[PDB]
Amino acid sequence: FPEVVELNVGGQVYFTRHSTLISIPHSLLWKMFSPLAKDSKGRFFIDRDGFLFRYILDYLRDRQVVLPDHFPEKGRLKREAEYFQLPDLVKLLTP
């Protein structure tokens, strides 16, 4: 795996460091990028909502997440956290 990974999430492209992807062991992204579907341009493909991945990705990097005011999609973000298997992130999203 390269040092900076080019991902395609539901058509949303993200560049990120490999260290961020494997930050939480036994998580979905850890299982994927620890020693895969690719698109036409060769980018590794994640079949999930591209917009919500920003905040999933921010948690892996900083182990915390600041949402905007009146964030209309917390329920959706929590669902994504479940898919990527991030128990603590689901916990933070528990009201």
Author numbering: 23 to 57, 65 to 124
What did the paper state?
The human KCTD family contains 25 soluble proteins that share a conserved potassium (K+) Channel Tetramerization Domain (a subtype of ‘BTB domain’) at their N-termini and have variable C-termini. Here, we present novel X-ray crystal structures of the BTB domains of a further five members of the KCTD family and examine the stoichiometry and stability of their multimeric assemblies in solution.
In contrast with the previous work, the expected closed pentameric structure is observed only in KCTD17, whereas the variant C-shaped pentamer, found in one crystal form of KCTD1, is also observed here in KCTD16. The angles between monomers in their assemblies vary from 90° for Kv4.3 to ∼65° for KCTD16, giving rise to observed oligomerization geometries that range from compact to splayed. Evolutionarily distant from these family members are KCTD16 and KCTD1, which belong to closely related clades F and A, respectively. Neither protein binds to Cul3 and both have now been observed to form unusual C-shaped pentamers by X-ray crystallography. We show here that this geometry is also maintained for the KCTD16 BTB in solution. Modest deviations at high q for KCTD16 may be attributed to flexibility and solvation effects not accounted for in the calculated scattering. Binding was observed for each of the BTB domains with the exception of KCTD16, which showed no evidence of Cul3 interaction.
